[PDB]
Amino acid sequence: RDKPAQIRFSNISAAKAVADAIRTSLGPKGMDKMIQDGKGDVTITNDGATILKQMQVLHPAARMLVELSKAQDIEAGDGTTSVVIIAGSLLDSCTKLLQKGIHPTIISESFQKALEKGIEILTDMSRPVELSDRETLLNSATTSLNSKVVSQYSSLLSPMSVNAVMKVIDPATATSVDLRDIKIVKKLGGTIDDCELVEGLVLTQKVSNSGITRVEKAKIGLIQFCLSAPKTDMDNQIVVSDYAQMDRVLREERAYILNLVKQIKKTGCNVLLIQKSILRDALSDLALHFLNKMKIMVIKDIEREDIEFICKTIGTKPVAHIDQFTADMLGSAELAEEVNLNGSGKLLKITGCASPGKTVTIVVRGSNKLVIEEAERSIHDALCVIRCLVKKRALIAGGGAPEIELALRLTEYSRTLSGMESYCVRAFADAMEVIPSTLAENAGLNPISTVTELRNRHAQGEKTAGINVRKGGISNILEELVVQPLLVSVSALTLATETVRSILKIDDVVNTR
Amino acid sequence: DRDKPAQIRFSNISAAKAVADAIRTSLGPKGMDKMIQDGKGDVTITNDGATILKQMQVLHPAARMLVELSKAQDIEAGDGTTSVVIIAGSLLDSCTKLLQKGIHPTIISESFQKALEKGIEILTDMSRPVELSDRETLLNSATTSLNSKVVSQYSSLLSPMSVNAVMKVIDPATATSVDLRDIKIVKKLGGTIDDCELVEGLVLTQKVSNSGITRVEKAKIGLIQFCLSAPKTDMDNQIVVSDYAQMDRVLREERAYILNLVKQIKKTGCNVLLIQKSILRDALSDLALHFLNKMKIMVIKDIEREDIEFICKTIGTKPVAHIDQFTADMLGSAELAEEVNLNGSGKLLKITGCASPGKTVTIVVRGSNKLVIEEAERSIHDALCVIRCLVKKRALIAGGGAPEIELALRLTEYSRTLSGMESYCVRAFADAMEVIPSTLAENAGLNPISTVTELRNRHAQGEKTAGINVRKGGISNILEELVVQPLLVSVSALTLATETVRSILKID
Amino acid sequence: KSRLMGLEALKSHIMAAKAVANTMRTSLGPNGLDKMMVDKDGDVTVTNDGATILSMMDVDHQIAKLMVELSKSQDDEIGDGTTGVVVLAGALLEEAEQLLDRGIHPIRIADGYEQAARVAIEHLDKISDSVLVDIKDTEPLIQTAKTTLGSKVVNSCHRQMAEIAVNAVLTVADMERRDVDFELIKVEGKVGGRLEDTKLIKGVIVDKDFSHPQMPKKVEDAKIAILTCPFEPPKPKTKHKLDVTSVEDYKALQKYEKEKFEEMIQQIKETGANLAICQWGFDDEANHLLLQNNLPAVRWVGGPEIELIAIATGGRIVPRFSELTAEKLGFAGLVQEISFGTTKDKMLVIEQCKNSRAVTIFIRGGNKMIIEEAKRSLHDALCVIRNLIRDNRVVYGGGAAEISCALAVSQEADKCPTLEQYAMRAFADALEVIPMALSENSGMNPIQTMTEVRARQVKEMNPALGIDCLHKGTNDMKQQHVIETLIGKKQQISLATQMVRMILKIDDIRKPGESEE
Amino acid sequence: ADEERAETARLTSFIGAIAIGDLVKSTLGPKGMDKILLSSGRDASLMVTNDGATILKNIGVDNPAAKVLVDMSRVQDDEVGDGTTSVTVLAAELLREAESLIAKKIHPQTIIAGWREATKAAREALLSSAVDHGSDEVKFRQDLMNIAGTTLSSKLLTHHKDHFTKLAVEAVLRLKGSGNLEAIHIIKKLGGSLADSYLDEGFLLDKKIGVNQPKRIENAKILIANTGMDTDKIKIFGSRVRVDSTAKVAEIEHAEKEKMKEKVERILKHGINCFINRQLIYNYPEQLFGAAGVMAIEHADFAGVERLALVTGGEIASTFDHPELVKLGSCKLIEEVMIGEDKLIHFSGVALGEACTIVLRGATQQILDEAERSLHDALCVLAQTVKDSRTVYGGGCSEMLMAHAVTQLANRTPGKEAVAMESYAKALRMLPTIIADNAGYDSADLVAQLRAAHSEGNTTAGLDMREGTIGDMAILGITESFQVKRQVLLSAAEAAEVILRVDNIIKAA
């Protein structure tokens, strides 16, 4: 009817127009935003990646952009802004073809055929570095650090990343290594110098007082039980109606607990970690101070992350009430360390844990809350770049330079393909050339001239050279330290091809009532 | 589609009904006079239906059929000009109903002629013969019709004179048809109604000739439609002036010409000549006229185009529009030609006795004041029109509007027995009929629907019973007070009406 | 004041060209859909061809005005492909607009179009042959005859109209150089027969004057006496009455006409020739006498009409009755009188085998509509064979050549890159508009049919395999039998490119409001 | 000035065509609903017709596509006669069905190309629906009757229609073995009755001269000539005009007088009793003929004088180029009789007894003129039905049978051509639906029944719009010829395909 024609044209207009605004990426371009919200709050933003994940929209076509960034982070952890901008290119293709009289189902098909050919050509130009070899990993990690904010804490960070991923690794080029095994914890105190890689499992938690086990031998505690004591879960016949009577009930309650924590220690506990959700109050607030005395660690109202990691890696299973004695299904352990460092920080390290041959943890340290943040982003990207090699190896051009390069090789393959699909893909080759162009355009004034020029300089270099996108100048782009993993650009194409395709597929208005 | 003719046709019907509404209150002797404003800003007071439509109509296609319809009525009966509009608009009320129901226009048009054919049967059985060769029977039927007409004051004196003209033109028992193509209405200044008379020959207008002879017996009727002089130059005459000499040169041609023409007419033998105007013939010479009169030939000069065509049929004095065509065959035989200057001042040519095909009578109608002459001209017209209607159609039916209910009632019952998809059309048509006697009763003054309900019930039981009576205003027998109309005058109202309603339904 | 400046002015232009283009697009090939022009008197005409339709058309914009001139040059040499230059010129701009939106100037692309034209022609030359002789070009000319007839007046081949059409052009070619014009050949039409009644005239045809259909009709000799002087006394194109003032001078005037018939009849005879062409005339009685005396006149010959016969014969017209010698008369190879119409009077054919500079092919028609279409086919025929005579080449065209070139120009965008890259891309798709819009007008999808032929461009080159152009299930161009001249298609490529170069020239987008009046 | 792009052009074109199709769908056939003709641009007077042909000429149209419909309608009137309205309706119907195809995605050529193949199939079907009739004299009479009665009703005149049908069929019947109309004179003439009509077996000039000249010739000898008396056809015996005197005006008039008389003598020298002249006969030579013994007829017609020359066995003089040297014609008798209130000259004993004159007798001028035309369309039909003596079953019976033929084809096909076949069948079938409204009997029942017959194979039930039911056709007074129908099918299609093909309508107004 008229419902399918008008929806496709507007939804494509509406994502694409926002994608035009958004395309100011790489380097210093556009003008800052101080943002008066639709709820009246002052918000300040910088960085393309951080914005896209945060972005709060209600236009169904634009929501695709938000979530596209998140999938990219999970597979690559690189190219999070990149994947959105190139998706906006595919949208640019879709309008011009509707006018030509190529039907929407056909334009979907062509995206697959664009993907299949494109990624194969990415693998062709790529120089295949080894994913278990440290030297090439070390160069690649520098590339990602030096493109982020750091340029002097980069020195410390490159080698820690090659070591961290080495612990989790699996020899193959198949999909392995994750940030479900790479555990990332923050700690106030230490410095970027003192950041520590523990090959086992270390959990981030807060431990009461300072004066507790920092030595070897531990039985790691995963409990799901509340105490039995007077006015807890055991009978008392003393009913209070006075401050004095209140005092008695609490005294006998805390007293029995001082006995109880000895049976907890008999086990070998030097670590106990309490469940997230109570069954009354859990171990009482009195119990925690008594436990501290036995030399046994605490955390009530534990985060979600810890519960998942403990059970998986160390094989740690729930245990019976203490009056009934612990069931002993707890895993192996040998370290209960409360990490203090430059006067601050509370942490649990578990060393001599059982493992499935995975799971590393990096501790992220900084003497000030902003200084931790500065280590944290930079390391995240450096871990992830080496990661991408195990999942699928090799190095291609970085900054999104092979999507510009890919355009030349790809036009040729469309013409000789000589399908219905050829025209859709050829038109996408020309759209991938707009990405350094569009980026610059919005910032200033005088748009047209520079825009045409950047496409000439990259194209003419041929199938092996063009303009760099992290230094400028026509020079070899395939190895020169302007590289990124094969995984980053193939992943980006893949994700884009799926999300965009979906806009074409709908017909007629739809709105659940 | 046929949607857009559907929309056009309703608009046309509504305009035609509105114009027809004025005439329902102008109907019959008790009719309400209509003061009509022309596009000329003059108020015209009429109670005759036909002229209201003619003098100004709206610019819609059904309105035009109404002028046409009554124009057709005049030639056919000359009577029921008012009534014929009444039934037409009343039928178009009936049609909207049929259309909505889903009776297609083609059905309503054939059913409307079928219902006429069916209507005429019922009418005739009621009708009752009278003689058409007897003077007295035709006069009683004509007298009754005259009381009903607008004009009546002098119509008493004009009624026996109206029959006398018509009786002579009836020679076999079939009584021919009797048109006005044989009865001629001529007027003369001066005189009374008693002085009016039926001249055996024809009476012709004007009389130019004072050098001619004034009474010639055994005369030969000659007809001029050729010139008496050589053609125009700039005048009807060939002669013109712009130099003394110039007139002389034309005169040489003219002089020769005028003698051969005047002489040629005399050689063939004529003692009456019928000559037209100097704007209807391209040349005529005063000189040629002085000689033409002085040869002792009786001349009327100046007469109409209409008159010349009239004479040619009636008295068999056929065209002579050239020299070549004066031969004996064309000439008439007149017994007498005579000047009369009595019974009204001014001189007219009477030819009394004429050798004629058919038989042609002329009534010189006359009166004391100009308006008296015009009233009697109306009066013979009304009187003669009804006589001609009865000689065509021998049987006699009642007036008063009673036949109109009597047809309707029969036509409803018969339709139901017959049945069919067209049943609805013939039943609604019969109810169309019920409007006209009802509209008449209102003008006579009595509650109208109540009048026409009661006459229906009298017709159902008795048949030939009550009708609208002018004394009572209402329901009293028309058997005790004869109100008669000729059979053709009612046949005409119905058949013409149907045809008009047929065209409009068929019209896109 | 108002001002469309730079970019704005350029957008305006694009809107004019694509509307003109599209009317032409749905008129491409014999699968074409006809043009109806309605005038300012409401007189309806059915035509075809780019050149004619524009000329009638009241120009509404600047690019529209440019195209009319362009078309008329295509019409004169080639006589086909008039609508196809226009489609290509507007198309190429419709893409330039898309390049414009990306952020390429119209300046950059417009230079690389000239280069992209140069590479397209180069590719063209490889496609099909470039060597024929004039007793073997005839089989392509038969292929040209199928399509050209069968989209205009008839929907069928007519072998008679085609074969008459091709001879005429050859008669003039062998007189000079192997070159013919478009003023040395004409299609003159006169209504009386049917479209299949036709003649080959080797010189010209004039109406032959006869006073009555009871007078003698003869012809003799092989030579024409071209005169302006009398062959029987004048009456030189004005009214005359008789201005005698006695009976005596009337009787006198008749015997003087008798002697002058004899004396002119003999003077012409003696030199050689006995059919006379005289520019002047004489009344109906004197003419009737001369026809009876025998040796037929032609009387009442136009002032142009005499110039026409003279140019074709190559000789001269005498200014006088004194001066007559055989030299001073024109030279014909045959004079024979042929029945013009099929119920009308005879005409005079003057064929020439002496010299030819005007060879008319005489076409007869019924109505005014059916004759105008039929002559439209003829004109186009005269022109395609004009290309062959001068240099003999044909190409398979209809879709075959364009697509093959298109793929070629596409490939070089990616060999070269630099300035011309964008220009090459746009030029390669423009060429592909031509088979595409032909399928748009035609019964079958434009995308689908384009895709079909493109497959066979990778599988095999220099194809006799284009799209359908007889509305068939199969697709070839050997079995659809459309052939163009190689030069003819070549001339299109030049012209389309041209239009772009003209709009580029100055920078005067300044208007006082006068820019299309 | 304006360039109407292909789609925008389609709509104007369609709406043009359709506006016209409504007027002529209503006029259609013997019960068809009238039109009101409105004289535009000059006054606003009215006449009522039921003739589709007249709608177009009287009331013109400024729509370009609708102008094609007008050109088409002209062609029926002369060549075929009847079918002027019958074509115009089908052509509008074809376009109507076209509308849904242009919209869908489907190009104009697809629709065209498949209706050409469909026209060839429909024609084959017209031959099948065409059964031979009127090979023998008895059947031959019955055969002309049916077609001729059809024509009159559809172009108006249905009251006095039957009387004229008897004379018209008899006229064609005499010819035998040729479709002449070149001997069958048509004379429409004031006088007579609307009921009476006459066929003279001979030739009849309605021109008279009075009883003042001879008119009784036995063993007549005919000279056919074009002789001026004031027009001044050559063989001058007068003078040139010259001016030398102020009395010279007199000299001219005399000189004409010797001219008139010297020409009378040359005529006289043929040895004849009957002289016919197309031109004027002045008062002076008229009297000289009546004295010589020679009959004078002046103001003869260009059609009749020529046509007379063939039948009687004379030969025309051709502008008086034969003053004594042209062969005569001959008749047995020349009688003057009064038929109506008129004097006629009756040539009887005409050499080729093929010749007849049909004399139409009016008593309302409106009827007399409309009657001449409608009867001429009918005689065009009659003479083509000589060349092939066969009928098709009219009434809607053929239209369904062509529609159905094309429906079975449509089914077979799955290509580009197949599309339009569905459209074409529907178009043909949509004509009886119009005939059904004209009957005044609902379309859906009748047309569906009719449809059913023809699938099974039957042409011996048609639509009786004169009973409002589905009825027999067995060559009744409501069948149509093959002759009319072949041309009507061909033109409707041909017109529609030209309207489709024109979508580059440039209007410069």
Side-chain angles (χ1 to χ4, degrees), chain A residues 97-322:
Chain A
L97 303 151
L98 270 146
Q99 300 177 254
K100 194 191 189 181
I102 292 177
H103 196 73
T105 314
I106 312 304
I107 323 182
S108 296
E109 304 303 311
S110 294
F111 303 166
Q112 310 314 127
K113 191 88 280 311
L115 180 55
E116 291 146 45
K117 306 176 295 187
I119 65 185
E120 165 59 78
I121 301 165
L122 283 184
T123 307
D124 297 357
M125 75 182 69
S126 77
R127 312 290 192 159
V129 305
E130 176 168 296
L131 62 91
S132 283
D133 177 53
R134 309 185 187 84
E135 289 75 55
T136 78
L137 265 42
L138 186 76
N139 281 64
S140 284
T142 319
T143 299
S144 312
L145 291 155
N146 282 8
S147 53
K148 305 295 211 295
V149 178
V150 294
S151 278
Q152 60 294 117
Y153 293 126
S154 299
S155 289
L156 321 162
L157 269 49
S158 298
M160 306 173 174
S161 289
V162 168
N163 298 122
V165 187
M166 239 290 169
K167 175 51 199 57
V168 187
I169 214 169
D170 281 353
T173 198
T175 287
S176 304
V177 201
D178 306 295
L179 305 167
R180 292 111 272 193
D181 293 277
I182 305 167
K183 196 172 191 289
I184 307 191
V185 303
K186 278 193 167 310
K187 195 185 81 77
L188 185 63
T191 60
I192 308 209
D193 295 291
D194 310 311
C195 295
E196 188 60 59
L197 180 71
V198 199
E199 74 308 298
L201 181 60
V202 163
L203 300 174
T204 196
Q205 72 187 49
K206 294 283 187 185
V207 185
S208 284
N209 63 275
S210 285
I212 197 146
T213 185
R214 280 174 294 264
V215 299
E216 301 176 84
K217 173 62 176 83
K219 180 60 149 191
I220 192 178
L222 177 75
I223 52 166
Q224 296 196 14
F225 68 78
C226 57
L227 297 164
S228 296
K231 290 286 188 296
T232 314
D233 285 290
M234 184 179 270
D235 303 307
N236 185 234
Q237 311 289 302
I238 313 186
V239 47
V240 316
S241 184
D242 288 311
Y243 306 121
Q245 297 193 335
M246 190 59 167
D247 199 358
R248 296 198 300 164
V249 289
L250 283 171
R251 261 182 303 195
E252 51 189 296
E253 183 189 305
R254 75 184 70 170
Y256 193 55
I257 304 165
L258 171 52
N259 302 294
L260 299 176
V261 300
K262 299 184 177 61
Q263 305 182 49
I264 312 166
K265 187 48 163 61
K266 174 189 290 189
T267 309
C269 292
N270 290 95
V271 174
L272 188 59
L273 299 168
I274 309 174
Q275 49 176 357
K276 181 176 185 75
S277 290
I278 69 185
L279 293 139
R280 198 180 159 287
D281 281 291
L283 292 189
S284 313
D285 298 289
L286 296 156
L288 304 177
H289 71 255
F290 289 134
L291 286 154
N292 288 126
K293 298 175 157 52
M294 287 292 144
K295 311 301 192 183
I296 297 174
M297 305 262 281
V298 291
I299 183 75
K300 190 169 69 38
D301 298 297
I302 199 173
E303 70 193 0
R304 190 66 274 267
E305 307 178 295
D306 289 19
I307 315 172
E308 287 190 303
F309 279 78
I310 187 181
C311 183
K312 177 169 41 49
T313 310
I314 311 187
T316 319
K317 308 289 308 188
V319 302
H321 191 244
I322 200 62

Side-chain angles (χ1 to χ4, degrees), chain C residues 16 18-20 22-24 26-27 30-40 42-44 46 53-54 56-58 60 150-152 155 212 214 242 244-248 250-251 285 369 439-446 448 468 471-473, chain D residues 1-6 13 61-68 71 105-114 116 234-236 238-244 248 316-319 321-322 416-417 497-509:
Chain C
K18 74 186 176 191
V20 164
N22 280 103
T23 310
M24 300 278 160
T26 44
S27 298
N31 295 171
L33 303 162
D34 299 331
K35 307 203 194 76
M36 178 163 285
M37 171 85 187
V38 173
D39 287 271
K40 318 176 84 72
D43 305 317
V44 177
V46 195
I53 185 56
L54 282 167
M56 303 178 292
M57 173 162 175
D58 302 271
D60 301 301
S151 62
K152 283 311 181 307
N155 288 296
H212 298 277
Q214 290 181 349
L242 292 299
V244 298
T245 43
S246 59
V247 287
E248 286 169 55
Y250 191 71
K251 311 297 193 281
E285 174 76 78
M369 300 165 135
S439 298
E440 191 188 58
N441 53 63
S442 196
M444 302 170 67
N445 291 268
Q448 297 180 238
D468 66 308
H471 180 67
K472 280 166 187 302
Chain D
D2 290 85
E3 170 174 65
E4 311 188 71
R5 283 297 312 110
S13 297
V61 60
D62 309 75
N63 196 274
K67 282 159 189 172
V68 189
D71 296 318
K105 66 189 307 170
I106 313 193
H107 318 129
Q109 188 52 248
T110 308
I111 311 177
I112 291 178
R116 283 169 180 164
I234 51 184
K235 206 157 159 78
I236 186 157
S239 286
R240 69 266 60 176
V241 179
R242 48 174 187 236
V243 185
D244 307 302
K248 201 54 173 192
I316 180 163
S318 304
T319 77
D321 299 357
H322 305 147
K416 34 179 181 188
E417 34 78 40
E497 289 186 3
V498 170
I499 291 166
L500 291 176
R501 194 152 175 181
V502 290
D503 43 90
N504 296 315
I505 308 193
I506 299 195
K507 284 190 70 182

